[PDB]
Structure formats: C-alpha cells, structure tokens
C-alpha cells in the first residue's frame, strides 16, 4: 500500500533514536550498509528519505550489541528488524495504520527502544 512509504518514514525515525542514544550514552553509532537500490540505481528515480539500509550501535571494540535494518524497495514482505547479535533475540517491526510501529501488538516507541538498547548495552558490550 502507501504503508511502504510510512514504514520507510518510520525507518528514518528509528535511525534517529539510534543516533540519539548513540551520542547520548557515548557509544559508537555505525552506518553498516547503504541500499544497493540507490548505489546501483542509475538514471532511475529514487525518492526514499535515506540511503542507509543497515545501522548499528557498536561498542569500543566495534562489535555491535544492536543491529537494525529495513528491507529494500524491491523486496517482498517488508519488515524492519532488530537483532541482539550474540544473544539470539530477533524482532520484527511492521507498520499498522493509525496504531503505528508495532512488534505484532506492542507499539515500538522511543522509550521501549531505549529500554532494549540499554539492556543490550549493559549486557553485551565487550569494552
């Protein structure tokens, strides 16, 4: 639907919280990868808000404790994902109309995100 555009809109903001929490708790924010559908888009049109497809919150060693990604514009079943690398925990945020960003039934607010990132930081970050 047009959800796709509002989901990408929500990808920007999740990224926004990442950069915030990052500067805030003074932990490396690392752009992990750009959309190949931008790099290799040629004369073709591109209206997406960012060019960053995989982000992360890494520690001092650079090993990440939080990984984030959304699926490209040309792939099916678009979801935005959150993974705690090393702790086996994966999340799948969709986008509902009126409700907003959900992990199924529970809304994914800044607050709830910050909670996860903290839990992760304290537990996982090697240095």
């Amino acid at each position: 639907a047009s959800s796709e555009r509002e989901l990408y809109e929500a990808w920007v903001e999740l990224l926004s919280w990442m950069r915030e929490y990052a500067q805030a708790k003074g932990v490396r924010f690392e752009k992990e990868a750009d959309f190949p559908d931008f790099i290799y888009r040629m004369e073709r049109p591109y209206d997406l808000p960012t060019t960053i497809m995989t982000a992360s919150l890494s520690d001092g060693l650079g090993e990440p404790f939080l990984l984030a990604d959304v699926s490209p514009r040309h792939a099916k079943l678009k979801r935005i994902g959150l993974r705690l690398p090393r702790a086996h925990i994966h999340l799948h945020a969709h986008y509902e109309p009126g409700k907003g960003l959900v992990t199924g039934k529970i809304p994914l607010t800044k607050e709830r995100f910050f909670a996860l990132a903290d839990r992760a930081r304290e537990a996982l970050a090697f240095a």
Partner: protein, 754 residues
C-alpha cells in the same frame, strides 16, 4: 593402484584418493567451496556432488566427491542433467543471502564464489531467463569490522564454509575463530580479540570470498591490476615462496606462493604483513660526507670520493661485511674480492659462532617422516613455518601422493579435530615456548645453559627428570631429527656436543640460524679468517658494510662505507660514503635454505631510486682497491656459481665444514629471538614489531619495572625503548630483550637508563 572411470576417461590412482581428486585427475572439474589443500575435508558446502556407479549400479543419492573414497572399478558422472541441475541449485542457495558488493568488494576477480557462479549456475532448462528466484529480505549483519590490525571481517559475505575455523584448529593450533549462533543466523566471530597466533594471515588466502581480507592492503587496486612477482621471503632461514603484488612502484600486498617441498601454502605474519617499511621511507641517491654532514652526490662523484678514502689503504686492512640476506652471488664475489685482496676479516650480519654448515641438512620432508623430534629453541620465533610442519608431524600426517593437478584438494588422510601426539617431541627453551604444549618432555632452562643440557643428552652428566626422559626417548628413537637455533648455534660448547649426539646416531639437523642466507653465505666462504674481526667485533680499518653494525665496531675505523637501503641515524653520524641498496624484495639471484635447498629471488617493480645491488657496489669498491673484480652482472655471475657446482633451483647442495670460533658471554641480558624483525615496525606492523622486556615478577619489580611501562634500554646493539612484561617462566635475575634483528640468541651487557 585402483581403476576409476570418470566420465569417458579412465585413470590410475592410489586407494585412499578422494573422488574429487580422482575427478580433477582425469582433467575434469566440479564446484568446490569448503575443501582446501591441506585441510580436513568435510562435505559442508555440498557443492562437489557427483553421481556414483559401482558394480553400472547408480547409487540412489548424489555423493560429496570430496569426502567419498574411491573403490575399484567405479564410475563417476559429473555432466548429467541430474548433476548440473543440482549444482546450479546449490549455487543458488549460496548466493541467496549474499550482499551484492562485487564492485565495491575487494575480493574482485579472485573470488571463488564469483567464478563458480558464472561456471556452474544459472542452469539451462530444456525465453527471458530468470536471474534471481529469491525475492525476500537478504541477511543483514555486521560489516567492515577489523579483527586485528591486519585482518578485516565482512560477515554478510561469509558463505559458512569452514576453511578458516578449521585451519586455526588444525594447522597452527590456535582456536581464535568460530561460528556463533545457529540456523541461518550463525556467523564468524572471536573472543580472543587480537587474533593471537602468528599465523593468522593465512586465513586471508583461503577464505573463498571477501569475508576475511588483508587489511594491510585494503582498497589499493583490483586483483587483476596488480602485477605479481613470485620470489622467496628472506626474512629468515626457511625461505617460503611468496608473491609480491605491486602497482606503480609501490608495494601493495604480500601473499603465499605454493611450494610444497618447503612451506606448503602457508606464510607467517611477519613474512606477510611487514612490507610497510620497504616502500615507505627510503634512501634514493648515494650520499657522501662534506662538511661534517652528508649531501647528494651522483654515482660519479661517489665513485671518486670512494677512491679517495681508500687510496691510503693496504689490502689487508680491508673489511667485507654483508647483511644476513645477501644473495648467493653477492657472497661469492665478496669471497673472491677478499681472497685476491688478501684480508682476514670478511663476515656477514648474522654469522653464528658455530657454523650451521657443521651439521648435515635435513629436508622438511624428513621431518614429517622422522620418529622423534628433539628441539632446543622456539621454532615459532626462529623459523616460524617449522611450527606448521610440526603441527602436521605431531598429527602423524605424511607426504601426500602427487596427482596430475599436484597437491590433493581433498586429502582423506586429514581428519578434522585429529588427536595430537605428545610422545613424539621434546622442547627445550629459555621460556614456556608455544609448541612446548605438543611436547611431553619439556623443560624451561635459563639462557646459554643448553651447553649443559646437551652434555647430559650425550650421556656424561645428570640432567633434570625431563632431560632424562628425553635422553631415553632419543635413545629408543629409530630415525630422529635435531632442531636447534640460537644458543646452541651461538655457543661453541653446546653446538659441538650437539653435532656429536647427532653424529653417533645417524640423524640430520635443522639449524634455525639467525642469518637468513646463513647456510649459503657459509657455503661461499664468507667466514672471517684467522685474524678475528667479526661482524660485531670492531677490527679492520677500512671496511664495507651491507647493514648497520654495533656502534662499537664503527667508532674508530678510518674509512666506512655503508651500503644500506634506508638511512639509519648511526650512519649519518659515523659514515663516510653511504650507498642506496635494494631490498631482498627487489633483488635477483639465489639463496640457500635451512634445509640446504637453493631458492630463487626475483625482482619486484618497486621504487629502487638510483639503487644498485651489492654485486655492483662490490665490483665498484674492488676497483678503488686495485684488482678488477671477476663479477659484473647476474648473467655472468651465474657461471661462477655453476662452476663451484651448486645445484639448480630447488636442488639441495651438500657442504660440511669443521671449524669454530667461540666467543664469551656477558650474561646479563638475553636477546630473545623473535619472529617480527625490527625494521618492520612501520604503520600497522608498528605495534606488533615493537620490542619487549621480560623478567620474573620478583626481579622485575626488584629493578623498578611496572607491568606495563615504556622503558628505555641499552645494549652493544643499541638503545631501544620497550614494553615490560612479567613472566613467571623467565629465569630469575635475567632480562629478556626482543632480539628483533639477526643478533638473536645472544648474551650481552646493558642496563635500563632512567
């Protein structure tokens, strides 16, 4: 042998053969991801599938050809629609979660995954062809992350072969890499952050894609753009075949060149990541002293200025001192220049008190085939690759059969996670040496004490328990081999007893000489004469230097000519005529192995500036001394060596020598032989080739030395700053200094300045 029929071709082949080797042996082919020369084969990628017939009774399922043995009268089909459809499918399962980086990825045109996809994938079913079936969200993870200052990890590109983790466990034996989660979620990772072992660069050449890449050379050029120069690595006695990759005069990256006789397809980290300095800062013109300082001079102005300092010289006051890595030709001329020009003192940078030529050389081959391994010294640090032949020797592995395509792709003989035999070897070292693990009979002595341990082994004294179990082991030994390096070869006492033990029992030796071309320079007669003036003893009055000697040998002399490649501070202050010289990377000629094998050096297109090889510089300084030299260039020099009758490339040259010039030991400090050489402390190898000071935690803190402090230290070989380490295995009241040169295994005075 057994009869196999591949497709339409029948072949002979020994019993144990992998069907994969038998397939390639008939001159065919098959996708091949997870298997690697010299590693345990396992069918994990599931690429090498064939169809197998065995009575024609086609087996119902497809076989992993890489872990299937061959039976007598067996048929192997690698072309059927059943095969090829399966292949193209397996190529698709691989590329399924892969990233899409090919243009940006440094694994360019040298990437097995790329080549195999364009070879066996996108299957022709019998208009518009379908390139990709999978239309979901590919796997997204951690990217461009360095494991060490030498190795950078892309996890998204990893295809889960086991090439790397397998290797760490099997070859050097340092389990510092493994997979993590499971399912589609698994990945490579570490917990031993540095990437500990000194053989961690090898995973770089194996990884079938660009997950594990050489950071020393990140983003320089695409693989095809590199001109490749095959040569030998002269940083030590083993002399591993290497490839030097260069674009526009500068040195980009070092890789391993297969040469199974010696090192197989393995390089050591110093061998591979210490190239930073050979292209970075260098002396490009000949220098000469004018007003208490040096200034630019042509080779013309410098040939005269060299005629000056030597016009007032008698031919017996002349010194000829080469570096440790001088060529077999550079040592022959110097022998003749010093012969005609009758002098007693001509020597080489690394020369050992006791000549390595004393003993009969043993082939690495012999080492695998030997029964017992008596070792005094640390192979890891002296002759690093010996670490890796002992890893094979310990596992009981023996020299594979040779197929049409050479070394096997799938040696069934190598099992993964093989048991290691602790009864097969014995190690004796001034510390807890690495391979002391794979040795039952092990004992930590203190510096220059081998002299006594060796006496014990002969059978004329009483050594510790270990040294008794060890005597008895070499006793019952059927065809053992002796390996020894620093103190043994630097100390006439030990070294003499050494050669005796191994004379009585008909066993060969591996002398881990601190001089690279040691066995060969000695073979050329580049040994000092009766007089005595050695590479460290300030003796002669006018001399040639192929290096930077102890400050003690310069100070005094009337005329000095240093033929360096870089400009040392000790030269810009005590030198009269300095001449640009080429590195071993940009040289040409031959060397001789710690096993007596003669290896070739080829010349890389690196920035030499106005440099000329010592073969030329020597001929030029022979004129300014009277006699016209017999050597000009390489072509003609080749005749002189072929005259003395030294075997062609790869052949072994037998040459014994009984004579030894001892010298006393001021035992305060020990020059711990290390792998990294001191002139490699550039850039990234910056931190790994720094020096170190080791002492027992009591004596350590007794002489005011915290566990992590940057101490300055002075020796006959120079002032070096150094990190200080506590080690409960260092003998009390001695200090171990990182002998980052060819002056390792020496005992000397010196102290800690404050």
């Amino acid at each position: 042998m057994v009869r196999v029929k591949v497709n339409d071709r029948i072949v002979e082949v020994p019993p144990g053969t992998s069907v994969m080797d038998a397939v390639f042996h008939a001159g065919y082919d098959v996708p091949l991801f997870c298997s690697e020369k010299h590693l345990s084969p396992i069918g994990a990628c599931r690429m090498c599938l064939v169809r197998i017939g065995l009575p024609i009774q086609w087996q119902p399922k497809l076989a992993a050809s890489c872990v299937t043995a061959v039976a007598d009268g067996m048929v192997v089909d690698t072309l059927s629609d059943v095969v090829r459809e399966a292949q193209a499918g397996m190529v698709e399962f691989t590329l399924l979660n892969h990233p899409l980086d090919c243009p940006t990825c440094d694994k360019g045109g040298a990437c097995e995954l790329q080549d195999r996809t364009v070879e066996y994938g996108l299957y022709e079913k019998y208009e518009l062809p379908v390139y990709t079936r999978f239309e979901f969200t590919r796997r997204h993870v951690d990217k461009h992350h360095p494991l060490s200052p030498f190795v950078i990890l892309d996890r998204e590109r990893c295809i889960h072969c086991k090439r790397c983790v397998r290797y760490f466990e099997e070859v050097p034996g340092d389990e510092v890499l493994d997979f993590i989660e499971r399912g589609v979620h698994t990945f490579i990772g570490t917990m031993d952050f540095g990437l500990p072992s000194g053989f961690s660069g090898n995973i770089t050449d194996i990884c079938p894609v660009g997950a594990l890449l050489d950071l020393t050379a990140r983003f320089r050029a695409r693989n095809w753009e590199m001109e490749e120069t095959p040569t030998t690595c002269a940083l030590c006695p083993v002399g591993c075949g290497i490839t030097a990759d260069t674009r526009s005069g500068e040195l980009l990256r070092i890789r391993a060149r297969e040469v199974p006789e010696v090192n197989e397809i393995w390089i050591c980290d110093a061998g591979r990541f210490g190239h930073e300095w050979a292209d970075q800062n260098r002396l490009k013109t000949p220098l000469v002293r004018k007003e208490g300082r040096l200034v630019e001079a042509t080779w013309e102005e410098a040939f005269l200025a060299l005629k000056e300092g030597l016009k007032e010289a008698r031919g017996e006051e002349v010194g000829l001192y080469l570096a440790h890595d001088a060529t077999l030709e550079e040592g022959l001329l110097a022998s003749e220049l010093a012969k005609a020009l009758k002098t007693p003192h001509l020597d080489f940078q690394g020369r050992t008190a006791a000549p390595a030529s004393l003993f009969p050389p043993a082939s690495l081959e012999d080492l695998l085939q030997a029964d017992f391994a008596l070792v005094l010294g640390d192979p890891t640090e002296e002759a690093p690759i010996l670490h890796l032949r002992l890893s094979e020797f310990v596992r009981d592995l023996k020299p594979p059969h040779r197929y049409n395509h050479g070394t096997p792709f799938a040696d069934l003989q190598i099992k993964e996670r093989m048991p290691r035999r602790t009864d097969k070897m014995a190690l004796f070292a001034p510390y807890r040496a690495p391979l002391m693990k794979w040795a039952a009979i092990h004992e930590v002595h203190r510096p220059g004490e081998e002299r006594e341990i060796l006496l014990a082994l002969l059978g004329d004294k009483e050594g510790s328990e270990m040294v008794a179990k060890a005597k008895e082991a070499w006793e019952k030994a059927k065809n053992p081999v002796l390996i020894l390096g620093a103190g043994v070869l630097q100390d006439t006492v030990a070294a003499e007893r050494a050669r005796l033990l191994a004379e009585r029992k008909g066993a060969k030796v591996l002398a881990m000489t601190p001089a690279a071309n040691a066995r060969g320079l000695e073979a050329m007669g580049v040994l000092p004469g009766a007089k005595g003036a050695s590479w460290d003893e300030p003796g002669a009055l006018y001399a040639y230097y192929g290096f930077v000697p102890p400050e003690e040998a310069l100070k005094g002399k009337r005329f000095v000519v240093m033929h360096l490649s870089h400009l040392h501070p000790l030269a810009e202050r005590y030198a009269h005529v300095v001449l640009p010289a080429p590195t071993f990377y940009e040289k040409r000629g031959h060397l001789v192995n710690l096993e007596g094998r003669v290896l070739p050096l080829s010349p890389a297109p690196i920035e030499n500036g106005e440099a000329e090889g010592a073969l030329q510089v020597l001929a030029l300084l022979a004129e300014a001394l009277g006699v016209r030299p017999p050597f000009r260039l390489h072509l003609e020099a080749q005749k002189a060596l072929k005259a003395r009758k030294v075997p062609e490339a790869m052949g072994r040259l037998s040459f014994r020598l009984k004579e030894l010039r001892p010298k006393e030991r001021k035992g305060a400090f020990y020059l711990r032989p290390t792998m990294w050489k001191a002139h490699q402390a550039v850039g990234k190898a910056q931190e790994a080739a720094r020096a170190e000071l080791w002492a027992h935690p009591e004596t350590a803190r007794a002489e005011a030395l915290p566990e992590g402090a940057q101490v300055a230290v002075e020796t006959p070989f120079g002032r070096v700053e150094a990190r200080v380490v506590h080690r409960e295995d260092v003998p009390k009241g001695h200090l171990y200094l990182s002998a980052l040169g060819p002056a390792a295994g020496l005992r000397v005075e010196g102290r800690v300045l404050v």
